[PDB]
Design an enzyme around this catalytic site. Structure first.
Site, mmCIF file in Angstrom:
data_model
loop_
_atom_site.group_PDB
_atom_site.id
_atom_site.type_symbol
_atom_site.label_atom_id
_atom_site.label_comp_id
_atom_site.label_asym_id
_atom_site.label_seq_id
_atom_site.Cartn_x
_atom_site.Cartn_y
_atom_site.Cartn_z
ATOM 1 N N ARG A 1 -53.089 -5.097 -98.293
ATOM 2 C CA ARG A 1 -54.284 -4.311 -98.595
ATOM 3 C C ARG A 1 -55.535 -4.955 -98.019
ATOM 4 O O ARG A 1 -56.465 -4.251 -97.626
ATOM 5 C CB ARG A 1 -54.455 -4.134 -100.098
ATOM 6 C CG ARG A 1 -53.348 -3.340 -100.782
ATOM 7 C CD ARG A 1 -53.152 -1.982 -100.117
ATOM 8 N NE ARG A 1 -52.135 -1.167 -100.780
ATOM 9 C CZ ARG A 1 -50.833 -1.300 -100.549
ATOM 10 N NH1 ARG A 1 -50.367 -2.245 -99.736
ATOM 11 N NH2 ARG A 1 -49.981 -0.457 -101.131
ATOM 12 N N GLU B 1 -55.544 -4.066 -94.508
ATOM 13 C CA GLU B 1 -55.937 -2.669 -94.374
ATOM 14 C C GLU B 1 -57.447 -2.493 -94.505
ATOM 15 O O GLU B 1 -58.041 -1.660 -93.805
ATOM 16 C CB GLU B 1 -55.207 -1.803 -95.401
ATOM 17 C CG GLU B 1 -55.617 -0.344 -95.269
ATOM 18 C CD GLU B 1 -54.737 0.590 -96.077
ATOM 19 O OE1 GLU B 1 -53.576 0.879 -95.657
ATOM 20 O OE2 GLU B 1 -55.226 1.051 -97.131
ATOM 21 N N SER C 1 -69.633 -16.621 -89.959
ATOM 22 C CA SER C 1 -68.694 -17.732 -89.874
ATOM 23 C C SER C 1 -67.554 -17.620 -90.875
ATOM 24 O O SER C 1 -67.750 -17.258 -92.041
ATOM 25 C CB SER C 1 -69.422 -19.060 -90.101
ATOM 26 O OG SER C 1 -68.589 -20.167 -89.784
HETATM 27 CL CL LIG Z 1 -54.456 0.878 -101.972
HETATM 28 CL CL LIG Z 2 -50.573 2.162 -102.859
HETATM 29 CL CL LIG Z 3 -66.594 -19.511 -87.485
#
Ligand SMILES: [Cl-]
Ligand SMILES: [Cl-]
Ligand SMILES: [Cl-]
Ligand SMILES: [Cl-]
Ligand SMILES: [Cl-]
Ligand SMILES: [Cl-]
Ligand SMILES: [Cl-]
Ligand SMILES: [Cl-]
Ligand SMILES: [Cl-]
Lengths: 156, 156, 156, 156, 156, 156, 156, 156, 156, 156
Positions: free
Chosen positions: D96, D99, D122
């Site tokens: 996730r 994602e 950074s």
């Molecule tokens: Cl999700």
């Molecule tokens: Cl899910």
């Molecule tokens: Cl960095």
């Protein structure tokens, strides 16, 4: 207290042990699920390294297989999930389910957005089951039910 | 004479046209399936490049979209199938179905061999259906049925 | 009826047009979000092809850029999401966020399971925010907040 | 003399021992962090192989787990970092976060250049923290804060 | 408002134009850098799509090539960086620098941690230059200097 | 007779042993180079599996680490070189050098062909050096010198 | 001023034109080499995008094909080399040379280090020739000669 | 009865033993080949896992290395061939031969079809040899001869 | 003089037009083969870009499809072969042939070495045909015959 | 109860043992097939890990090899199939079959749709046979028969 895994190796090794003991005792996955109060697909996935079992279920299946307390503790840990992390399956049986996604993946997306809206059908708030049904032509069919919560994508 | 494609490019370009015209005419996938005598998932998959349509259904859908005779003939060709040939999906909606296979793929293999035997569940002798149901906790769920013929391995 | 995309090509081409027109008119992302009632991160993601906009917001942003009704309709379609589908980013700015995931990914999993339980932090029931803060050492820092629902994995 | 690793194998093996001993001793990640004066996310990442610990902190965590001086010396070495070097995660919890980067990665780049300038946020001058908050529906949410210094790209 | 790119295609197309016009007018990279007040390595990288130029420098280089205001505006936009996003180089000239990293990469890490500490040598607060020197054995050598700020990893 | 390796495994295992013994003895890479008559970068690379050492130097470093004649013979064998054979580095310290090549790789090619001609800068007739400078802005910088022979491509 | 390419697209497009015009005029590669004073393998490689030609040779070849001055100038540019940048060849004719390297690659390394020493056989100070010979058992054989300078690896 | 391997692991482990014993006894590849009646490239390739040896030669080389009759039986088995199955070589010595194919691969295809016709130059009906020659410009060169039968592709 | 292709694009574009014209005229692959004197599998492969046709056969099939003299000349050129150069097939029909190789690949090697010896079954001195036969148990079967010359690997 | 494998490791290790014992006893694959009532290709594939054997056949083959009841039980388990899960084969013998698919794969698809219809040729309901035939031109040929059930796509 919940414990978790950061690598697959321990639970894959435990799954190796389950497969071996299950074969030696000539057991079925249904037999290992009986008495746990949990679903066949969930318990089998847990033994194959893809879910933790609650303590009571872990102890039940571990007694049936001849596994010790260390194994039961490991079975109760949250795994690092993924049943094919090293490429698309070569096994025909597993591959057919991937092929189903190749043929219908774009259709599933299109029909989800039409019937529900923007968002996803959850793989977490989710249940899976497989059942065998007769085909009128004489054979049998597998009916796999994917039952997932719709989670909408809303503007913010 | 049934015709076939050797590359995805023409049917993906036709799918592009369908998406555009469907949006321009404010049509649904259900409206395109209506009158074909075929199921929503099959017709939608065909329009997205994953199945041929019979001539009658192809002409009906093409009439609704404003597509010509060349488009209908292309729709009746057997495609080179595959809805994600260029890697695992990044789209969340399609990815969740891949995730279901990652978590339950080894379970599906194990339970197919236990309940059916050595062999496969077909992705071509196959039916797909989505139902929307109410979620007890609020909202909605998708109940997706994958229904495939069991094909046994033939020792020789 | 909500429309959806099955390929990224149309929304990426629209994003290309947005980038070009925004530069020609010397506009900011903040100015394009102004007047929509929506959050900067959400509108910017939508314009870069990663979200649909509701009709009113789509019409407002297209007005600022000089885009027509066809572009607004496309902006209202559900996209096929993914901002780097062709490999890990080479761009240093995006790569640093990937690097953050490489260093802390296993920690996030471990601490989610400790503080919440088995399950996930959602990427769908989810909000993203970036703030600029002045640094006592001179210069500035970005504070990026990821705010996601915990979805538990329960035995079934 | 500060020491460093050239391969991940030793620190991954130490992380294996940490996971096993914390489960055997019923310790939490917070319990290990207590008394080090360092943040939960930093100490947890170090134990999982992604940071060195200073000698005092290393001895504290090793004392709680029952690890010897050889383990503490290894924990004090600079690691070869990367928590998923062998592909995009399959684990849903880790995925996730990947994602989130797929959906918002191009937005993060766009907004960094608008609000800060050319350059990077950074991943080294950088802090991460995770907080649990209530959701109005009775569940909970994770608020993960990424706090990184802006380093400008300037012509030379 | 500083503008930025989300895809490489526009700046790669501009680089294509620069290469072609440079060849037509028999120009050198040194000639295009002359008069900008910037370093050969920085301006050359900018023209090849890897840096933005300040407005004044962009207009000067654009004047030498006969490029219009649209090209100059694009040259001033922050690029999506990466000179080989589609695989390890096959070109022998670029490949040798990749080989230097293959042979000495683990050494550079080891020596950075010994002489500086935990952290990185920056690729952002960073200067590059190439010099040609005569080899005493006959022929010539390239002396390439990488000059990067040390950024420490400190506990938090 | 000079010996050579066909696989990396033995020299990677020897490097593992070097790292462990170096840590146990609290030694520096500079201390292992002292007395060999060779450069720090060359000896360090050799110990990490990327060069053979001559007998005299191999015996000296093995004496400092407590390695036996079998280890010294292996250190004198020509290795199968490559410090990241399994993908682009995930480690931040190593990655920055790869990023340096991503940003400036096409520039290096362009400037080599302009200042030297068609051909390559050698990675074999080649010296590498890293120097630390205490920079006026506070902190320090690494100055890394790549010094390679120009080898021309000539028609035949 | 020597010019160079940063992308393969222009020289691949010129190679396409060469192939087409060569077929239209029913010419051989040998006929295109005749009169240049250069070797068949070098001129053929140049026309296929892998070497620059000197001005006089470029002009001679361009005259025989009916190519203009723009083509000759591009043929004089230093290319971005690599005849299979998109994967191992599928073409049987090219694949066999790759297979020769798969079968004998470790042998070539071993014998180079035994007969020459540590170092490489150059691909730059290098000549290639292919000759046709009759087979005593009927048919013909290709004798391909790879002739490369030995470049030693020396301690520094 | 001729035996064959289905995995590389046993012959690679034997090659590991050969390399070690060869180093311990300070032998050369030439010394191991001498007395077998076979060519240096063939015997060296066999020992490195890429060919079977006939019984007489296998016993001779096993006698020189101190290997037992189990090792000789394995050396007589037909291997699963391929000296770099895990990616393009990183080793500079091996890589130069790959680079030779990158530069000249399309030329070899072109000239094979011109001088021989449609078909291939065989990698099976095939001999390879390496020859050290002195370079007039000081130093030495390797002349590697690839000698393969032409197999024509004929219509059927 | 026999001509050859160095890239797949022209012959794939010609194959595209074949597919389109074949469908427009409702032709069969058998109809295109009739009158050439060549085998169905060879002519079909040629049209799909994988073989050259002799002039007379090329002119016959081009007359049947309505292709001009330029197309015929291209059809007479030796192609750069490979019908899936961009990954393992996703199409179920093509994938099954790959799956037979996954299941039986190691068996084919083992039985070739037992029945013939060390060496290969040729894919060049090779004929392929496919035939439809009734299945005694119901339905149809495809019988695909692979007919290849054995080329031995002999020591040299 | 039929048992199944979830990982290849156990059956691949048994295959390793089969290969070793077969060589030690100087057996042929045909000798191992004799008495099983099954075909050479099926039993060989089973022993190499690609099929389960029935109990009677598993017991017979184990008796010939000196394998115990654990090996026989494992041979009766349904495997996770796939003989090259880690990339396209490098072995020439195996590769030639992959090459036949590269050259003829699109032809096979085209001709299946022409002669059978929309659907696939099964790799599961499937027979394989190898015959050795003498070549009139001298030498021998392999005639390999692939015999698979036609499975039609079922519109729904
Ligand atoms: Cl999700
Ligand atoms: Cl899910
Ligand atoms: Cl960095
Ligand atoms: Cl940096
Ligand atoms: Cl070099
Ligand atoms: Cl070289
Ligand atoms: Cl061959
Ligand atoms: Cl062949
Ligand atoms: Cl099948």
């Amino acid at each position: 207290m919940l414990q978790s895994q950061f690598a697959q190796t321990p639970r894959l090794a435990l799954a190796d042990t389950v497969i071996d003991l299950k074969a030696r005792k000539n057991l079925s996955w249904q037999a290992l699920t009986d008495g746990t109060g949990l679903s066949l697909a969930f318990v089998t996935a847990a033994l194959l390294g893809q879910h933790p079992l609650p303590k009571e279920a872990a102890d039940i299946v571990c007694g049936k297989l001849g596994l010790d307390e260390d194994a039961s503790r490991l079975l109760q840990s949250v795994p690092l999930r993924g049943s094919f992390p090293s490429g698309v399956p070569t096994d025909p049986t597993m591959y057919r389910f991937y092929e189903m996604l190749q043929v219908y993946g774009s259709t599933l997306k299109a029909l989800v957005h039409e019937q529900f809206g923007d968002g996803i059908i959850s793989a977490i708030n989710f249940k899976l089951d497989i059942k065998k049904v007769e085909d009128p032509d004489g054979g049998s069919r597998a009916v796999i039910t994917l039952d997932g919560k719709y989670l909408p994508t809303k503007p913010f």
